[PDB]
Amino acid sequence: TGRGACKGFYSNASSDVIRYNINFEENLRRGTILFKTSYGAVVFYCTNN
Amino acid sequence: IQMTQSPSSLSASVGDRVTITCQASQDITTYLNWYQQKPGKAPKLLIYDASNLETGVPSRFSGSGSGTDFTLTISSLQPEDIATYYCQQYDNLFLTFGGGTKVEIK
Amino acid sequence: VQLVESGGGLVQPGGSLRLSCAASGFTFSSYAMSWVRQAPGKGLEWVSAIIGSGSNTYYADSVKGRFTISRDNAKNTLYLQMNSLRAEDTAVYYCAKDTTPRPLYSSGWYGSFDYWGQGTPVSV
Numbered sequence: 001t002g003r004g005a006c007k008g009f010y011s012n013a014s015s016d017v018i019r020y021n022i023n024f025e026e027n028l029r030r031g032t033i034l035f036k037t038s039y040g041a042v043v044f045y046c047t048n049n
Numbered sequence: 050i051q052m053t054q055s056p057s058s059l060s061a062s063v064g065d066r067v068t069i070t071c072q073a074s075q076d077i078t079t080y081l082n083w084y085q086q087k088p089g090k091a092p093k094l095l096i097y098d099a100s101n102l103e104t105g106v107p108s109r110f111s112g113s114g115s116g117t118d119f120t121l122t123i124s125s126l127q128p129e130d131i132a133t134y135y136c137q138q139y140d141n142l143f144l145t146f147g148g149g150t151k152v153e154i155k
Numbered sequence: 156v157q158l159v160e161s162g163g164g165l166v167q168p169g170g171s172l173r174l175s176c177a178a179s180g181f182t183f184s185s186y187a188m189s190w191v192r193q194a195p196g197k198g199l200e201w202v203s204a205i206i207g208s209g210s211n212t213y214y215a216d217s218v219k220g221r222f223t224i225s226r227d228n229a230k231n232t233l234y235l236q237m238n239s240l241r242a243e244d245t246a247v248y249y250c251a252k253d254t255t256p257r258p259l260y261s262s263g264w265y266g267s268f269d270y271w272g273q274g275t276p277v278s279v
């Protein structure tokens with residue numbers, strides 16, 4: 001729930017893996033990634049400083 | 050093994066540091082827990098083993114006690130608090146749900 | 156984690172009914188289970204409990220000899236059987252579920268519960 005408009009066949013089943021496809025040689029040096037847990041909040045980030 | 054719970058009912062303004070107590074007529078020593086029961090809906094554990102809350106509960110709830118005397122308080126009251134606090138020990142497999150306490154808005 | 160029941164409504168006094176409950180979305184075999192009922196305007200009287208394996212089965216004395224609770228772990232369900240019903244059994248049932256993961260080959264202390272059903276109203 002929250003997924004963009006699925007095109008083609010789709011199902012409401014509970015998935016187990018989420019996949020992100022990224023451009024040619026592109027890098028996420030410029031952002032963060034946010035998770036949720038039953039025991040709080042988690043975030044992933046990367047820096048040299 | 051029989052329970053008493055107080056205050057039996059209470060109406061308070063939205064924001065008060067409400068306090069509630071349980072009794073067990075025996076030295077339970079830690080084995081007591083509280084639940085939040087929505088009238089017309091399902092209950093939900095708040096704190097267990099007296100002092101330690103469930104992972105899906107904000108730290109606005111708290112409580113402790115050892116022996117026969119126990120307590121469960123909230124640091125502040127919020128508009129969704131119109132429900133019923135219950136407690137129940139698990140020292141004896143023959144168990145006893147508590148006396149129940151209600152909270153109302155003002 | 157999802158809990159629903161079956162077989163609610165109205166029953167004649169002193170009859171019999173096959174009350175049911177079903178669970179899904181968690182490790183069922185390792186957790187204990189219980190029956191509790193919210194009779195109108197009073198407490199959550201404890202009907203019964205069953206330990207993970209199923210050998211240990213417990214009742215209160217308003218519950219002893221009148222009802223038969225049973226687990227079927229292979230299709231994730233909680234059966235219940237009614238006999239010699241009174242007017243005082245008018246209540247609503249949530250089949251509650253234990254939080255402590257005991258192994259299938261063990262037995263012991265239940266008592267802490269984290270999830271309940273939807274609530275099946277039964278009047279008699």
Ligand SMILES: *[C@@H]1O[C@H](CO)[C@@H](O[C@@H]2O[C@H](CO)[C@@H](O[C@@H]3O[C@H](CO)[C@@H](O)[C@H](O)[C@@H]3O)[C@H](O)[C@H]2NC(C)=O)[C@H](O)[C@H]1NC(C)=O
Nearest residue numbers: 001002003004012013014015036087090129156157158180
């Ligand atoms: C995925 O399924 C879960 C249930 O397994 C859905 O959980 C719901 O998530 C929302 C937040 O996304 C919860 O927050 C809010 O709760 C109040 C409760 O009264 C509700 O009125 C609000 O509309 C809002 O939903 C909600 O408690 C929680 N449970 C239910 C029953 O809705 C979840 O929304 C599903 N969707 C996604 C995108 O994960």
Ligand SMILES: *[C@@H]1O[C@H](CO)[C@@H](O)[C@H](O)[C@H]1NC(C)=O
Nearest residue numbers: 001006008009010011012013
């Ligand atoms: C998913 O569930 C929603 C519920 O409203 C429904 O509209 C939709 O058709 C369902 N899709 C599938 C593939 O089950």
Ligand SMILES: *[C@@H]1O[C@H](CO)[C@@H](O)[C@H](O)[C@H]1NC(C)=O
Nearest residue numbers: 027028029030046047048049
């Ligand atoms: C970190 O990386 C940036 C380029 O992304 C560089 O200019 C900077 O000097 C590096 N070191 C620190 C301490 O920021």
